[PDB]
């Protein structure tokens, strides 16, 4: 191939391979699940360890009091987009004194992520995000990609073996709108569980959860704060 070294080179089929190669970076990262009710928006991600001696990687990150993200792909590209999201939320609160609507923040991601895909020497962002937020329009689950394209979704899963989680959510998508918060998180956990192989299941060390909604600001539970959600579990069936 020779149409795959630069973002500024179009393939004869009508495609850009460097955007598609950047999309492969998202799939290699560990799975993360996002879903919402009428009142809450929940992010559930799978922490990953390179070795048992090393700790698990951060998957959920803070953006603002009403917005939180889960990452999938390159770490530095995730932190770079996270800092841009934080800055845009800070600028909105500095100027207007009101929280930045989720819809508009994701549109700013779409505008920024597009710039490097059209300039020579530049590259696409090697990270896909799941954005959970709450504003005047209620809870929101958003999806961003290496391609500047973004999606408003009821539920979504990205990363390794995310298809298994995607199918689970697709069956229970009508269930979520009337769901209690405790029941909503369990749905997100049960979707993330499908991604893992048959030998292993969700533990207190490899599960990270983020919740934002009408009740409370965005909060990340990691270790001891996670066990109340895992306890009360319907066993792994096949």
């Amino acid at each position: 191939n020779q149409y795959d070294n630069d973002v500024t080179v179009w393939s004869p089929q009508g495609r850009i391979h460097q955007i598609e190669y950047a999309m492969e970076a998202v799939k290699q990262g560990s799975a993360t699940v996002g879903l919402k009710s009428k009142t809450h928006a929940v992010l559930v991600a799978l922490k990953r360890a390179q070795s048992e001696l090393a700790a698990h990687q951060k998957k959920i990150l803070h953006v603002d009091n009403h917005i939180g993200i889960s990452i999938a792909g390159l770490t530095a590209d995730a932190r770079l987009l996270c800092n841009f999201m934080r800055q845009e939320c800070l600028d909105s609160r500095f100027v207007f004194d009101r929280p930045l609507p989720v819809s508009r923040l994701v549109s700013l991601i779409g505008s920024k992520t597009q710039i490097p895909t059209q300039r020579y020497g530049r590259r696409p962002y090697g990270v896909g995000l799941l954005i959970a937020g709450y504003d005047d329009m209620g809870p929101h689950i958003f999806q961003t990609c290496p391609s500047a394209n973004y999606f408003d979704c009821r539920a979504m899963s990205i990363g390794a073996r995310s298809q298994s989680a995607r199918t689970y959510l697709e069956r229970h998508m009508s269930e979520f709108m009337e769901c209690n918060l405790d029941e909503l998180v369990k749905h997100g956990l049960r979707a993330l569980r499908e991604t893992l192989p048959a030998e292993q299941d969700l533990t207190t060390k490899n599960v990270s959860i983020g919740i934002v909604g009408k009740d409370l600001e965005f909060t990340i539970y990691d270790d001891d704060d996670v066990s109340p959600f895992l306890d009360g579990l319907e066993e792994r069936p096949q």
Binding site: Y21, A22, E24, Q57, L74
Partner: protein, 233 residues
């Protein structure tokens, strides 16, 4: 020929993956996070007895409570170390406090993929750093050890090894680690594993040893003190 910011069909940056390969040529470094302190150990790799012993500095001081072990291309490392030292003193000036071991590692991780050709400054980076770092120190969250590579990904470690013989030392730490280990056993283990994966015998002038424990500050071990820990082979 391709650019520096080119993705592989796999989904990785070539220059980053190649920078990981540059570490596999550097000397082995081991850090161990004990509940009562953090110890760092590295081999100097002497090429000639004419070369001065204390000349090679693969374990350096960043702050009174933070130590850093380096592996790979040493020239690239000391650029990152100076930036880390600047960051700690910029933070001290602004906030009148010592930085956390996590924040220092995060600050260095921000320089990760800040390289490119076009749409960049005249003095902008052309390539990544061929360096893997082990940040070991004590803050208000107890003793901590962090690992960082050219990709920018940084994570806490109970015990980690990086260098030429990375996998060999990783498996040796894997079976000889308790989260309740003592600092006496911590230095011992790092010395025991170091001689196994090396081409040269362990001498008092051959290696560097450092300790960061809640009580006392970061300490560079003197030749006489090394002989007291090598007495227990």
């Amino acid at each position: 020929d391709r650019g520096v910011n080119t993705f592989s069909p796999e989904g990785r940056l070539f220059q980053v993956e190649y920078a990981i390969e540059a570490i596999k040529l550097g000397s082995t470094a081991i850090g161990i996070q004990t509940s009562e302190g953090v110890c760092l150990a590295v081999e100097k790799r002497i090429t000639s007895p004419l070369m001065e012993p204390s000349s090679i500095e693969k374990i350096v001081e960043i702050d009174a409570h933070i130590g850093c072990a380096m592996s790979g291309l040493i020239a690239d490392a000391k650029t990152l170390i100076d930036k880390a030292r600047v960051e700690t003193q910029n933070h001290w000036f602004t906030y009148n406090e010592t930085m956390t071991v996590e924040s220092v590692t995060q600050a260095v991780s921000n320089l990760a993929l800040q390289f490119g050709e076009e749409d960049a400054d005249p003095g902008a980076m052309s390539r990544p750093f061929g360096v893997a770092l082990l940040f070991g120190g004590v803050d208000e969250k107890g003793p901590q050890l962090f690992h960082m590579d050219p990709s920018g990904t940084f994570v806490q470690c109970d015990a980690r090894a990086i260098g030429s013989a990375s996998e060999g030392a990783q498996s040796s730490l894997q079976e000889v680690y308790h989260k309740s280990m003592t600092l006496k056993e911590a230095i011992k283990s790092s010395l025991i594993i170091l001689k196994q994966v090396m081409e040269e015998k362990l001498n008092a002038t051959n290696i560097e040893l450092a300790t960061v424990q809640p009580g006392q500050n970061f300490h560079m071990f003197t030749k006489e003190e090394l002989e007291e820990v090598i007495k227990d082979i």
